[PDB]
């Protein structure tokens, strides 16, 4: 782009080399937020006074010859992550004054690498939407078109990255809440392998309960290099690095259709263009496989588990809740689906497919997804069916990258979803980096 910002790694290098100080990096980011966040409303919790103190402490370490991978790099994090001294509300008015007393694990890891947290980014109520709007902070608007959703639930994070306010962010994903905002705002987002990164401190307000199923946390940035560094900083253990040097020989499964939902022409064309660029770089592309799992059964099973997980096994009055024994059977079903993808990835290195079937939708005041619809090539389509596109990685557990491809006819970003086998998170990042090179 013509107007650019330093990446997270470039900022740390500029501080380590002495071309700028950590306090200057912090003050520059504070200025971008105050200058740009007016019409976007992404950074809704601000901690600028304590951040400047941390930036000064970072410059103290720099002078003492200390070097850390993110030393002095300013960032924000999704509001649902605990930071000691800041509220964690999940957009609930009842929890607006719930102040965390300890940093979450991800925050602690990033701080130990030297990062400076300026504040936290906006979310929908209960993290339960592909928008970012709540009565505590208001609505986040897509920086590419203020009339469209920024995505959710990590939508404030993606908007702050798209507007260049900070180079690094971190979100959570149970129904696409990392991939979808990255796609709506045209930035990079890694849905990580299930259980690869600790959710400690991503607590429902006033509890120490984090989701034990489907949900993952993962980095968001504007470069694949920043994603890989942030992944290595926050992983439970160091994950296998990628040995993929180029696209020659890579085996890609290209999917632009789903038995339970649809993609529009611009999205289909964009995902196809990415596969063709890899084919021109020596990769092999298939458009079907007998080992592809039953995507229709997958979305139905994923949805039943998702609803149970979201309700904590509570049923509406009158109806009978799912029994614990039935829950154990559901996990067996999921494990069986995970192994089906294992077999698929014996033949393929990656699946290429849409993140969602269309670009960022107009702001919706309808809280019930069953009462929402979407425009696909001027045609009306069901909203909730779009869950099919993100269900594979969430239910199967695979890592999935959301990376910029381009924009549609209205300038709204379109991202590609790159799905690789469990624990190959660095492959997903690396393939995305190679795809971006192949497109330029």
Numbering used by the authors: 14 to 453
Manuscript text:
Here, the ligand‐free crystal structure of UMG‐SP2, a metagenome‐derived urethanase with depolymerization activities, at 2.59 Å resolution, as well as its (co‐)structures bound to a suicide hydrolase inhibitor and a short‐chain carbamate substrate at 2.16 and 2.40 Å resolutions, respectively, is reported. UMG‐SP2 belongs to the amidase signature protein superfamily (AS family), which is characterized by a highly conserved GGSS(S/G)GS motif and can be found in bacteria, archaea, and eukaryotes. SP2 shares the domain architecture of amidases, with an α/β‐fold containing 12 prominent α‐helices, 12 β‐strands, and five larger loops.
OP972510) were solved in a substrate‐free state (SP2, also used as an interchangeable designation for WT UMG‐SP2 for simplification, 2.59 Å resolution) and a complex with the phenylmethylsulfonyl moiety of the suicide inhibitor PMSF covalently bound to the active site serine 190 (SP2PMS, 2.16 Å resolution). The primary active site cavity of SP2 accommodates the phenyl and nitrophenyl moieties of the suicide inhibitor PMSF and BBC, respectively, through a set of hydrophobic residues including W143, W382, L400, L319, and L323. In SP2 and SP2PMS, K224 (part of L3 at the perimeter of the secondary active site cavity) interacts with several water molecules and H215 (as well as S222 in the SP2 structure). These interactions consolidate K224 pointing toward the substrate binding cavity and blocking the secondary active site sterically (right insets). Due to the steric blockage of the active site when empty or partially occupied by PMS, substrate accessibility (in particular for larger molecules) is limited, in contrast to the complex structures with one or two BBC molecules bound.
